[PDB]
Amino acid sequence: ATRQEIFQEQLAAVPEFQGLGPLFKSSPEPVALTESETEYVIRCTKHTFSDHLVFQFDCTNTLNDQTLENVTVQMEPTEAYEVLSYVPARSLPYNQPGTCYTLVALPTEDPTAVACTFSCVMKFTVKDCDPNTGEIDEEGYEDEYVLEDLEVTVADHIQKVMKVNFEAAWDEVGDEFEKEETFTLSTIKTLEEAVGNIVKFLGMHPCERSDKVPENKNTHTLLLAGVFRGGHDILVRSRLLLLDTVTMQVTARSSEELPVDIILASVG
């Protein structure tokens, strides 16, 4: 019931809902859904709750050419979410936030079910402006412009942590939960690439005193933490092993099923 919870509530004033929950964590990065000063400009922020995720869309329908009307947001998904609805910002005039939303409920115990990329197309009936003194009339015609993808992260949902019981938990999480991938690294003997994807993608803490490396270091383990949405946790141990090639054991162990498969992917 994060900062992001406040957002769960902020979102709450609307009542067209088709489920929400309480926000779990929010976006690790807001995405401009329309690039740099477009005909219309979008920056988007994504919010995770224990039950649903809302993408609430922040913006300045840019051109004074336009006001966009009959606005709703399409999203179309690859890696699960049940799609309840796409939201229409009834009207959006120039240089101005208005809100449009798109809503999903988050499946949690499936292997592959909350990280997703969704495909966006903006629809509107496009109406011209006179800014001097305008006119607002029923007529005007649609064109649709394709909008940017939304990808959903493994950090919009997670609180990164330190364990309630690492020793035990550490093992335990293995017990019930554990999936694996091995690579043997023969052209590069460096973590670092891996490292760029892992600290940063997961947004969790490297550790159990196994984080630190100077501008070099012989060996490394991140035994790493945070908790996933829907309550249950997602746990990772990365033993990176240097013989002098790297061969490595990445473990994801989880207190949630969907995360073990996910971590191994997500980290990338």
Partner: protein
């Protein structure tokens, strides 16, 4: 600014001092009068003589085609008028109008008339329906009548040039001019009109090397021009472009822009002096008599720059030389295939650079437009300059996110977002460059295939083409290569392996990339990918799509044209002229697809 432009040495003949030229529009025949005394009529197109006539053997000063009339008018300086019905070359009538050297005829087209000026210091009007009556005589001379031109604009009113340096403009109710103005400081050789109806200029010629522009409505010499290299035998209004054609008494061409008024160029066919000129009224082809011969040149593009968003706006810019200021068209309504449609009105733009390419972004979106030799890319809705630079040659990285360039040297640099892509950097002999999915460098009468990340000679095929269109997803691709045409498969996997293995053929490219599926022997007016379907025009004006082993003509077109755009949803094709009336014929893409799939065994 550059001659990256159409100049064609359209047709040639070396001959004599061909004094006079007169045009047959209605069938592009041309009539020429010589200082030989023989006159000839040609179809230039194949350098073929339509007819020649020995009207006299004295130099024959004046000529007309009377198209309405279907007869051709001729006069030689036996002071007689000889008529042929050009509908053979069967000679209708003869009589003596003007009894002195007959210099010029100007004709009322609307109204059944033949106006003549002659050296007798007389202008006579004769009425053909009255059967060559001398209906009226226009007089107010001071010298031989050297030239008559009808302001055809107001046919009705006309202007006269004499070398006593003066110009009389007349009203019918003035068998004399309305006035005379004191033009030349030499003599007024010639008088000519300003193509537009809107404004009014004449140019008049002298060898004094000074040009004066005049506005009739005010009645001013708008301005007087200098710069010249040699007595201007003639100078003319470009009716296509805003340029000034200058001509000399040595047969010098200098062009000044009738907008820059900067010497754009000098050309030498030192075929000596500008005796005559006559111009295509369609404003594109012109001929002039020179001494050493004559030459005709062809000077046009076939299109404006426009590209269409599949919502349904073909945004073009300009009209023909109008400002770019005019783009738009989402329309609003529907009507029958044969019948015609309405446009919206809301310009944007008012560029300067004069283009000749438009190409959409791969999502319509970003157009890159080149003109004056540099590329302005627009942010379009934005009406923003998306970007600019100078070209030579181009490929969008088809993906819609990079672009390539051929620098006016010839050695490649490519930019993705203003970053050169050097991962790929052959710079071999080329011819042209092709982008798309798969890289073409057309070189050494070959077309050579390249990667997108490093270059690879994927294949080389036999010859060079002219154009490529790629199917949509690239896959089957269509290359236009004169009469003849091919359809191909590109097979990936081989490459992946081969590449892994490395050891290959690339002189030929590698024979383990592409396959030659079938070829149609083809002439293309314009052509289309519907996916991988080649829907095409032929310049034989049937619109056909090659489908199923079949090529079918959906329809045949007036004469052939430009493919407006088929907005699939609508399943219709919008057909496009170049004169801004759009016609649409619906198909229904599915039908094609239906066919495609089933053959593929996707019957269900």
């Amino acid at each position: 600014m550059p001659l990256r432009l159409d100049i064609k040495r359209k047709l040639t003949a070396r001959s004599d001092r061909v004094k006079s030229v007169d045009l047959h529009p209605t069938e592009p025949w041309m009539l020429a009068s010589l200082y030989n005394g023989s006159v000839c009529v040609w179809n230039h197109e194949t350098q073929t003589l339509v007819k020649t006539f020995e009207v006299c053997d004295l130099p024959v000063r004046a000529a007309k085609f009377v198209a309405r009339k279907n007869w051709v008018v001729t006069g030689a300086d036996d002071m007689q008028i000889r008529v042929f019905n050009y509908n053979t070359l069967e000679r209708v009538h003869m009589f003596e109008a003007h009894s002195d050297y007959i210099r010029c005829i100007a004709v009322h087209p609307t109204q059944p008339f033949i106006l003549t000026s002659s050296d007798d210091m007389l202008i006579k009007l004769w009425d053909w329906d009255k059967k060559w009556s001398c209906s009226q005589v226009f007089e107010g001379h001071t010298h031989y009548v050297m030239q008559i031109v009808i302001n055809p604009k107001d046919n009705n009113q006309f202007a006269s040039a004499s070398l006593d340096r003066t110009i009389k403009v007349w009203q019918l109710g003035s068998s004399s001019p309305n006035f005379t103005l004191e033009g030349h400081e030499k003599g007024v050789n010639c008088i000519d009109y300003y193509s537009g109806g809107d404004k009014p200029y004449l140019i008049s010629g002298a060898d004094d090397r000074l040009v004066k522009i005049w506005d009739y409505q005010n009645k001013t010499c708008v301005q007087t021009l200098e710069g010249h290299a040699q007595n201007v035998s003639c100078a003319s209004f470009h009716p296509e472009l805003p340029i000034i054609i200058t001509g000399s008494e040595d047969g010098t061409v200098r062009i000044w822009h009738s907008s820059t008024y900067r010497l754009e160029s000098t050309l030498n066919y030192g075929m000596e002096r500008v005796w005559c000129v006559a111009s295509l009224r369609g404003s594109n082809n012109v001929a002039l008599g020179y001494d050493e011969g004559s030459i005709i040149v062809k000077l046009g593009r076939e299109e404006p720059a426009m590209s269409m968003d599949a919502n349904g706006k073909i945004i073009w810019a300009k009209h023909s030389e109008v400002q770019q200021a005019n783009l738009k068209a989402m329309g609003d309504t529907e009507i029958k295939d044969g019948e015609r449609l309405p446009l919206a009105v809301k310009d944007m733009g008012s560029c300067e650079i004069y283009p000749q390419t438009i190409q959409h972004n791969p999502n319509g979106r970003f157009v890159v437009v080149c003109g004056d030799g540099e590329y302005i890319i627009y942010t379009a809705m934005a009406l923003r300059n998306k970007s600019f630079g100078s070209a030579q040659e181009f490929a969008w990285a088809h993906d819609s996110s990079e672009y390539a360039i051929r620098e006016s040297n010839s050695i490649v640099k490519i930019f993705k977002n203003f970053k050169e892509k050097k991962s790929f950097k052959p710079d071999f002999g080329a011819e042209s460059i092709y982008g798309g999915f798969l890289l073409g460098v057309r070189s050494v009468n070959g077309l050579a295939f390249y990667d997108w990340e490093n270059t690879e000679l994927i294949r080389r095929i036999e010859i060079q083409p002219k154009h490529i269109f790629w199917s949509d997803s690239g896959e089957l691709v269509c290359i236009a290569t004169e009469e003849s045409f091919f359809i191909l498969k590109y097979l990936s996997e081989k490459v992946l392996a081969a590449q892994e293995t490395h050891e290959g053929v690339t002189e030929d490219g590698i024979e383990d990339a592409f396959e030659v599926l079938g070829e149609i022997q083809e002439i293309v007016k314009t052509g289309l990918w519907v996916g991988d379907c080649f829907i095409y025009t032929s310049s034989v004006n049937r619109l056909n799509y090659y489908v199923g082993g079949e090529i079918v003509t959906i329809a045949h077109l007036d004469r052939t044209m430009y493919l407006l755009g088929y907005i699939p949803k609508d399943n219709r094709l919008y057909l496009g002229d170049k004169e801004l009336n759009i016609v649409s014929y619906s198909l229904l893409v599915s039908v094609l697809e239906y066919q495609t799939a089933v053959m593929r065994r996707d019957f269900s």
